[PDB]
Structure formats: C-alpha cells, structure tokens
C-alpha cells in the first residue's frame, strides 16, 4: 500500500515518453509500438490499482501520500484518489489509450507527436488524482502547451486561428482560478490551507465566499462550455485532428465538471447553495440553445461540436438541484458522453479525409461504397439521441430524477424547467438525422471506383467496437458506474442550514 501507486501512475507516461527523444531509430515505425506499449502498461497498472486496492465502501481518500516541495507557500506533492476521481481516471486512461491508437498513421513528425500525447496523458491523470490545490492548478495548466502544439501542427484548414483563440481563451479563464487560489491560500495559512482534504471545516466570512466561488466558477465555465463562454469550442473542435479531438472533447471538457464538483460543492457550500438555481436555469436554457444553434450549422464537424455542447447541460443541472442522484447522475453522464462524443468525432474525422468535402450539402450517398462506417455511425447517432438501451439514456433519466426529487425547489420551476429540458428530446433528432440523411442516404453518382473510398479496416473497426461495447454494457445495467458512496458524504454538509 505504501508502495506509491498514484506517484507512479502520474510520472510513468511523461517519463517513459521522454525516451522518445534521444532515440535515432527510424521515421515512424518503432515509435508507434513503443508508445502503445507504454499506454497499455499504464492502463493495466491503473486497473490493477483500482481492483485489489480500493474499497467502494468508505468516503475517505485512498492511496494518499505527500512530501515537501516549495515549503514557503505550503505546497506539497499531496496526491490521492477518491470516489469521484476514480471514474474519470479510468475513463481518461481508456479513451487516451484508444486515441493514441487512433493516431496510428501519422508520419509527419511522429516523434514530437507521441511524446506530446504522453504528456497530455500524464497531465490529465495528474489533475484527476490531485489532492493539493496548487498542485491541482499546476496539473490544470500543464497541458495547455501540448494541446496548442497538437492543434497548430496537425489538423484542419484554419488551424492557426482556432489554436490561438483556444490558448488565449483558456489561459485567460485560468486567471480567476489563480485568483481563487491566492484568495483561499492566504486565509489562515497556518491552518494547512493548501491541503484539499483539510479544507472541509473552513468557515469563511460572508462577501468572501461569493468572490472565491465566482473566481472558480468563471474558470470552470471557461473550461466546461457554459452559454456566454462557449464561443471558443466550435473553432477548436472543427479544426482539430480527430485523434486530438477524441481526448479533447471527451476528457478535457469533463475537467471543468470534476473541478466544479470537487472544490465548489465540497468546500464552499453556502457560496454554492445560494447560487444553484441560476446554474440550473443556465443549464436548462443551454440544453435547447446549443441544439437550436447546432441545427443551423452546415459543416458536420461543427454540428458534432455543438451536439457535444448540448449534453453539457445535463451535467450542470445535475450539479445544481442538490440531491444524491442529481450529483451522481452527472458522473454517469460525463462517462457516457466521454464515450459518445469521442467516438462521434472519430467517426466524423474518419469519414472525412476520405471525401475531402466539409459542407454537408455535397455529401452524396456514401452508404454504397462503405457500409460499416454507415452502420457504426448510425449506431452512435442513436446513442446520442438518448435512445434507451445505450448509455445515453440512463444518464439523462437519473438527471431528471435528481431534479424532480430536489429539496431546494417547490413545484413552480421544478416543472417548467423539466418541460424546457424535455424539449431537448424533440429538438436533438431534428439536427442529427438531418445530417444522417444528407450525408449518407440518397444515391449519388455511380461511385463504383474503389479508390479514395474504402470501408474501415481492422484497426478503426476494432476501435469503434471496443468503444461501443461499454456503451451497451452500461446502458443495460448502470451499476458499473454507480460505485459512488462519496455523495452520501458529499451532499451531507449542505443538507440543513437555512432557506
């Protein structure tokens, strides 16, 4: 147990990828295998740590440890896994391994690329496993350069504008986060202060709770797209290589929700309990606004980006409406979206690069040359339609149940908000099938020449199937992802004071 796992689990990828540099061997071949082996080793170590070294029955922290790092402003190597973290950690390992696999036929650089992939890997796990607030911030901003390089080196026509908007926007958003760090770091620094575990008992005065709450909420709304702060997403998604975009719109977005769950609802209750209803309202109007603007777009990559935007309203409404299941249904939702959005962007980037046409009007009948892409695309479109069976349904269902049985509401908005939320089910197929019909159905020209038109080979097909099967497995019996008993203590603080 004291043999450190999380330290290894964080310093393995970047270290074992630093050997790609100073290795003159080839152009592209050996690096792919040397990276996929490291990724598989890391994932196996992750699942070994989870299986026989975790309990699911105690809401404390597990596998924790700490050291002394800078010691002036108390900032340690404090690190520990917990219930909320575990799901996102496993999902990150899984989807990033599969993204690195999907990035197989890249020979442009193929040495900086896989190393940057491993760096983003290590950074994501570092954030998701953090236990010291400043270290959480460090892991947050560590990934900001690798993603910029992956954008500006590979992907899309207008890569530059998208990349620079994304980097400037995210770096600016993190400023309010650093403001909150400086705010609650100096608040009695003799009491540990920078130990995210020992902050549960902090009793801050009024008019300061609100400022720290907002300093974190602004940064989160920057990372996790909230309506007035979403303009950056369509550009940095419609221009990214599908290999990047898989992990980008499947993990990096969910950090904005994991942080909001971990440092807002757990640390600043009376700063969050007096601000939950507006969060709920914003999420409710987002669910419909994102879809109503998705239907308007004309290049299917941006349409997929907006569909990813829309489902981020269920997470919001689950963070508000303070219940056990409303918070708990949010986690299942971030998992069942990290699957679906990632797979849909992979399919969009794989259909494209075969047709070299981005505007959804000229896409002929692609069903005739390549059937398997059509099948695995319609399947995940159905998944994104919140169709039952697949995991896109039970998440939204539990979100509804959390809102309905919420205690901080009395039947007036508890129904109108449910109504405006259910309009999403009428609205989403209108823009998903409108793409499925223009780009796949109909009989285009006699596209008989089997050139620049080949169905998915073994690698892409296996990736699709191996991401698909978890969706069914979760949507049939959704207690594989309800192994969360921290909410029974996470929603314990809030539940009696005023109002």
């Amino acid at each position: 147990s004291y043999f450190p796992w999380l330290t290894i689990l964080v310093v393995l990828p970047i270290f074992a990828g630093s050997l790609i540099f100073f290795l003159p061997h080839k152009g592209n071949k050996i690096v792919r295998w040397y990276t996929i082996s490291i990724c598989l080793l890391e994932f196996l170590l992750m699942t070994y740590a989870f299986c026989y070294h975790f309990q699911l029955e105690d809401p404390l922290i597990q596998l924790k440890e700490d050291y002394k790092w800078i010691d002036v402003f108390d900032f340690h190597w404090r690190l520990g896994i917990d219930g909320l973290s575990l799901g996102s950690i496993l999902l990150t390992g899984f989807i990033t391994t599969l993204a690195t696999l999907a990035a197989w036929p890249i020979t442009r650089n193929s040495r900086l690329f896989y190393f940057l992939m491993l760096a983003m890997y290590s950074g994501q796990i570092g954030l998701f496993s953090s236990r010291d607030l400043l270290l959480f911030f460090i892991m947050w901003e560590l990934e900001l350069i690798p993603v910029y390089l992956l954008l500006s080196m590979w992907g899309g026509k207008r890569r530059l504008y998208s990349a620079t908007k994304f980097i400037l926007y995210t770096a600016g958003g993190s400023i309010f986060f650093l403001i909150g760090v400086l705010g609650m770091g100096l608040y009695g620094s003799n009491e540990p202060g920078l130990d995210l575990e020992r902050l549960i008992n902090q009793s801050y005065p009024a008019t300061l709770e609100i400022l720290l709450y907002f300093g974190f909420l602004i940064a989160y709304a920057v990372k996790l797209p909230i309506i007035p702060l979403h303009t950056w997403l369509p550009d940095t998604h419609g221009e990214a290589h599908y290999s990047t975009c898989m992990l980008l719109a499947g993990i990096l977005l969910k950090m904005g929700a994991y942080g909001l769950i971990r440092i807002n609802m757990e640390l600043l209750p009376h700063a969050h309990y007096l601000f939950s209803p507006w969060l709920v309202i914003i999420g409710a109007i987002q669910i419909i606004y994102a879809a109503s603007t998705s239907l308007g777009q004309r290049n299917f990559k941006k349409r997929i980006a907006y569909s990813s935007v829309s489902h981020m309203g269920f997470i919001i409404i689950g963070i508000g409406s303070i219940t056990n299941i409303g918070l708990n249904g949010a986690i299942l939702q971030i998992l069942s979206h990290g699957f679906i959005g990632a797979t849909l962007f992979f399919l969009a980037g794989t259909a494209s690069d075969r047709m070299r046409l981005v505007y959804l009007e000229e896409l002929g009948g692609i069903s005739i040359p390549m059937p398997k892409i059509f099948t695995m695309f319609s399947s995940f479109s159905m998944a994104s339609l919140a169709l039952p069976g697949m995991s896109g349904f039970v998440a939204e269902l539990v979100v509804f149940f959390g809102l309905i049985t919420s205690p901080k509401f009395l039947l007036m908005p508890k129904a109108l908000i449910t109504f405006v939320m259910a309009i999403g089910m009428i609205l989403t197929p209108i823009y998903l099938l409108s793409m499925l019909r223009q780009m796949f159905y109909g009989y285009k020209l006699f596209n008989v020449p089997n050139a620049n038109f080949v169905d998915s080979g073994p690698r892409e097909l296996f990736i699709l199937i191996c991401i698909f099967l978890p969706v069914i497995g979760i949507g049939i019996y959704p207690d594989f992802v309800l192994s969360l008993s921290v909410d029974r203590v996470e929603a314990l603080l809030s539940n009696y004071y005023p109002k």
Binding site: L186, Y187, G188, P205
Partner: protein, 172 residues
C-alpha cells in the same frame, strides 16, 4: 468599578488579506459618571453617519502594556475623529485604573480626546490623573491577551493585521 449602562460587542479578526474570526469581546460603558464620552463611544460602535469602528484595526500592540485602536481613517494613529466635531475636552476622572482590562480614550495631550481608544492588558496605576476611564472588558479577556501577544515589527504594529469585522451594542 461602578454601575453599567450599555454593553458593546466587538469582533476580532486576524489574517492578512482578510481577517478570520477568532472570538468576540464584550465591554461595559459607564454612562452614569462619564456620559458624554460613553455616549461618543457607544454611538461610534453602532453607526450614525458611518464614523464607526466597522473595519478598523489595532495599530499599536505593546506587549505587557496595552493595545490601541479606533483609527477608522488612516490606520496609522494620525486619524480618526468623534461626533462632537473632531475632538472635545476631558469629561471627568472619577473612575480609576484598577487591573487587567480597562478602556481609556487615547488622547494627544489633555483636552484632545478623539477616536483612538486603548485597552490595558495589565495594571497601570501610574497612568491615572491625565487619562479618562470609561470601560472594562466583561467577556473576551483571553482574546485580548492573545492579541497582546501578537508578533510586532519595529513600529510596534502587529505583523498580522488585526481588524474589527463588526461592532455593535448588545443590551442587557
């Protein structure tokens, strides 16, 4: 010691971007033998056009001697005022300094009382004859001593800011 008329409560906050609460002080005001000065204090501690102690500090903490505060203007001692203009003369010298915990309007030469008050963490018999007495602490002596034992720079200020978050009147 004499009769008590009003009871005033003070908050105490330390930390130096902002002050976390540490406790609460409760003091009595002898409105029976020094009415004008006691009324000045009690009015400052509540409101009445904003000239109050809400957001003041203790800008001089002499260990084993005293703690002075009430400069809601400059935080340096060269500020602060009172309701009856800016200063007024001494009122009376009936009540005398006795022991741990008294209140005295920290003057700047006789007949020049102002906003600066100070509490005596120790016995001061020598001081009497030229300083007013209008209050003793009734609850919070330990917090007063904790403030008195705070760290001080060369200017005898506290190195951690010691502000008063909220101040008011709490009747019997």
């Amino acid at each position: 010691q004499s009769k008590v008329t009003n009871k005033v409560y003070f908050d105490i906050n330390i930390g130096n971007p902002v002050g976390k609460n540490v406790g609460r002080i409760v003091i009595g005001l002898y409105g029976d033998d020094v009415p004008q000065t006691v009324e000045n204090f009690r009015a400052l501690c509540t409101g009445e056009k904003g000239f109050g102690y809400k957001g003041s500090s203790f800008h001089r903490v002499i260990k084993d001697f005293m703690i002075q505060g009430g400069d809601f203007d400059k935080g340096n001692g060269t500020g602060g005022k009172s309701i009856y203009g800016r200063t007024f003369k001494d009122e009376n010298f009936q009540l005398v300094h006795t022991g741990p915990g008294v209140l005295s309007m920290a003057n700047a030469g006789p007949n020049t009382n102002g906003s600066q008050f100070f509490i005596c963490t120790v016995k001061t018999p020598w001081l009497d004859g030229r300083h007013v007495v209008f209050g003793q602490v009734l609850e919070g002596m330990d917090i007063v001593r904790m403030i008195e034992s705070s760290e001080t720079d060369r200017g005898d200020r506290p190195k951690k800011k010691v502000v008063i978050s909220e101040c008011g009147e709490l009747p019997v």
